[PDB]
Design a protein around this nucleic acid. Sequence first.
RNA 1: GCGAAACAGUACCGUGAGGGAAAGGUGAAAAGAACCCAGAGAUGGGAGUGAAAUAGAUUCUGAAACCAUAUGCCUACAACGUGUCAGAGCACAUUAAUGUGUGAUGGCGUGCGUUUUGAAGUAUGAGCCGGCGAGUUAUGAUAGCAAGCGUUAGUUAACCA
RNA 2: UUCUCGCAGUCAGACAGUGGGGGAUAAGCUUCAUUGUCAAGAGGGGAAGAGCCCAGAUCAUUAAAUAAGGUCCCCAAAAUA
RNA 3: UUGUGGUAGACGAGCGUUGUAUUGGAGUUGAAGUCAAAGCGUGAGCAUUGGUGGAUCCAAUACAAGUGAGAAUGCCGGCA
Lengths: 56, 99, 49, 158, 114, 144, 139
Amino acid sequence: AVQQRRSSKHRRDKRRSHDALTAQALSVCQKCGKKKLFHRVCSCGMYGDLRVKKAY
Amino acid sequence: MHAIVVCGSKQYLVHENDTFFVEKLEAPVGKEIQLDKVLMLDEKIGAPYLEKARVVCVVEKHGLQRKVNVIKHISQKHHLKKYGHRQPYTKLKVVRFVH
Amino acid sequence: LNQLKSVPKARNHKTKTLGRGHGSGLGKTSGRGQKGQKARKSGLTRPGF
Amino acid sequence: TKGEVRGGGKKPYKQKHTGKARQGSTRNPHFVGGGIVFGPKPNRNYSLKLNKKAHTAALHTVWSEKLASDNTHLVDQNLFNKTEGKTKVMMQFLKSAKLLDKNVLFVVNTLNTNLEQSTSNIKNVQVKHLDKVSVRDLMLANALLVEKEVLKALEGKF
Amino acid sequence: MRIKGGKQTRVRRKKWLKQASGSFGTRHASYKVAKQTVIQAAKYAYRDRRNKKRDFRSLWILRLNAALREQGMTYSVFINLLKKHNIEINRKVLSELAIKEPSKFNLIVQKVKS
Amino acid sequence: KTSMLTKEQANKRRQWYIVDAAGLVLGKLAVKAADLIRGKNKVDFTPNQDCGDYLIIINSDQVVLTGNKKENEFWYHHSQYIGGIKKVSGRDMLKKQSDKLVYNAVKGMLPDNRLSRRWITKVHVFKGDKHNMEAQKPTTLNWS
Amino acid sequence: MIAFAKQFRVRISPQKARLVCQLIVGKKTADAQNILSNTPKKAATLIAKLLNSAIANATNNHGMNGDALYVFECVANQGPSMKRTIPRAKGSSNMITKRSSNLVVKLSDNPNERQELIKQQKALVKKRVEGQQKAKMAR
RNA sequence: GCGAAACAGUACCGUGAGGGAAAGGUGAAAAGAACCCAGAGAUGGGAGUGAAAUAGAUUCUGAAACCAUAUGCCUACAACGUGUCAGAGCACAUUAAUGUGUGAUGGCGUGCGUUUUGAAGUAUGAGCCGGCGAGUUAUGAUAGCAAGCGUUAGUUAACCA
RNA sequence: UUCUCGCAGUCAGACAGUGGGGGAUAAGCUUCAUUGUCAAGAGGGGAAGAGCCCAGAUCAUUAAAUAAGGUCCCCAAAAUA
RNA sequence: UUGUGGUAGACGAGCGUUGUAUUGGAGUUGAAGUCAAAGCGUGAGCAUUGGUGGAUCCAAUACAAGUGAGAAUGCCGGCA
């Protein structure tokens, strides 16, 4: 169904301002640069186990 | 000191060089006028409008109050009728109220 | 007179236009009222009616 | 007007089942493409009627109060004889006239061809005929000369 | 002949709608809601000019009666004493503010007796 | 013109007060408490500044029920349910919670504002005798 | 400051870009570039690349320092869109709309430039009132 | 203003009769942004032209409506067309003006037009603004008013000047 | 308030009360005469209270006392016996 | 003194839109459009200055209305 009026800016912001983003995990690399997410492979290959991957 | 005087249609308690606003009374600015509509003459009260405690005052300035733009209308009708009324005001102060 | 001093000689009478004004009247009212035959395009009626 | 607009008009939608404005044609006198009911026609009379008695009275009073104007001195054949068709002599006169600010009318009835040839090179030179004039322009020139031989002639028409 | 009405109407409605401002959200960036706000403010000012005298007089009477009952008398008896005798010229707001003045109101206390 | 009445603002000064007069009917005590916590006894009164007083009450459950109201006095408090109304007995609220009865009375005799509920918060009435503000030297009074 | 890049007609929904720009505003170069790269969106990497290009412009072209620059402004305001018909059921139809935005980015070196505009406005009002008062002496 | 300045009955909408809009302003002048910056380039930025790129080509003014932002205020026990009249608190000192703006909190306070005896209305229709939109032209009479006129006053028609 | 001019708006009102009619003598029901109100014109109060009391409201005042009504508190104001 | 409750309804007088008929004055040392502000009036209005801005306007007297815009589920641009 629908009402007989419109929804102003304030109602939307009360809906939108609580849709705001949040923070994330982080992982400083202990052997290289290219700071990466936690529990994620750094973007320069050399990972803890080994260079499980590449830089690109 | 202190004295309640009557001027225009309002009362005011006046002290040394007391500045306040009163209703306009078709009087010039700067004149030293002695009012006889005064009471509370130094903690003394008079039924016949106690006098001989003269209060000489000087008008600080005159002016026009904010515009009273009355829109006389009826609800559920437009009936817009605007007219700007102005009630003149008067700023004044006592000089030394020589008694 | 002239094109900068043409003072009037007092011949100009009030003109009534029924479709103008809200604080000057002649609004929706238009000097006729709004009901019945008077609220339609029923002007210019035969005087024999 | 509404019915004199080129272009087909009809109801573009249905009467019911449409909560918008209902129109029997595309154009109405609330449109910005045509259809306004009330407008001008090339027949507005704007006709004022002036009586012959009133016309003569106006002529007489305007002439009489122009007699008292700044430019009231009389003219004759003399300046026509002296002047040529050249605007040179006309602007020499203007220099000697000292009345450049006035739009002086060279009102003549003899029609000296030098005046018609000349008298358009400055913002004050203008020559017209005598018998074909109007009171509006007669009092509007703010100054203009009169002829000496037409006194009884102007008296005749009053 | 086509009469110009583009800018002139803009200026007219700009003058008309200027009085509407300082409202919650957006009640001043339109015409009808702006008229609503302006007319409500005008009627509020009209009713103030009509009745703030009685409002302030009632407030002064209430406060003055509270002070009287602090001193040990009611407004009815006090005004009766002021009326039937003790011809004194003083207003309610000034009477209630005279308490702040040291002993000036107490002077009224011993003088207002019939 | 206008006297330009200005309110006395930005001042924190209220004394401490106590009363032990349980035994009299609800109405007079409730109206006196409402006047005391409202600011009806100030020569220099200010409605939008500290005006209400601080009254603590000791042994407020000694009130007796007068007249024929013994098995007649009850109050309505309806929770938004099916038959959620609560009907508590007057003859039992005397021994049971009675300070909240005075709270309800004074809150019913006050003008409904945020200041009204703040005045309600500014009242410390309890059935017992051991409290905390008695150490603040509460000036004993009665019916203010 | 410098490193500004106006981008009108960026065809994208403004419902999402302005919010993320507001979240991003108030961060340095690398600590924002890495998080933009660590996004599943389709705009953050391009915003980081544009920021790098703008920093290059500021440092090389204007000869700026590029030692304290941070994100001073990011917003996705109204953008002209393409609105055409779209079929529906029961023989009805609607108007589909593919929107755009007006991308604009500004950077600031100092935490200031919120009050420099205030000082400019103060100078403007002072010179305005000076004209007004020299007019008043003409009364 | 011709629907039709703008490549108009054009694109387009119907088989067919038929219907059908919008689209001018650079700079006096391209002297149209050479060289460089990041990039894949668009692009944006310098550099330069230039009176100026709020003169840089969606280049004649460039608003309202709208989209957002933070600077000074205060605000997350909160029952309010949310404002009035009072007034704390905060920042400035003027179109010198009962200083200017914001506003802790209190007495008070159901939007608009409609026909409606009566709608805040559970009747009505409207989000917004921009432009635009409704008592009309001629002819004839009546009446009021203003002007002339005179003791058959005046006006012309057609036609001519 | 008698006479001439004409622009009007108006025969779809309601209500408060009295005498009525139909009606249970109900009607937020209808129709008469009849005193007024809103309509054509508002305030306070009556818990909000259209026909209820003061009732007649150029404007401005933070001035005086009253009318109906109210005076334990809030919504004002009062007690004495 | 009557005074100003007052709907429709009747009565009177002004301001304003541009344009015209003009005497006058103002424009690259800026004319206008544009928007802000702690003025002026009794009302239709005058604005004062500033700036974006870039070549035409403004005061006064007479006349013309397609002459004063909130409602027509009014047309419609833009935009929620």
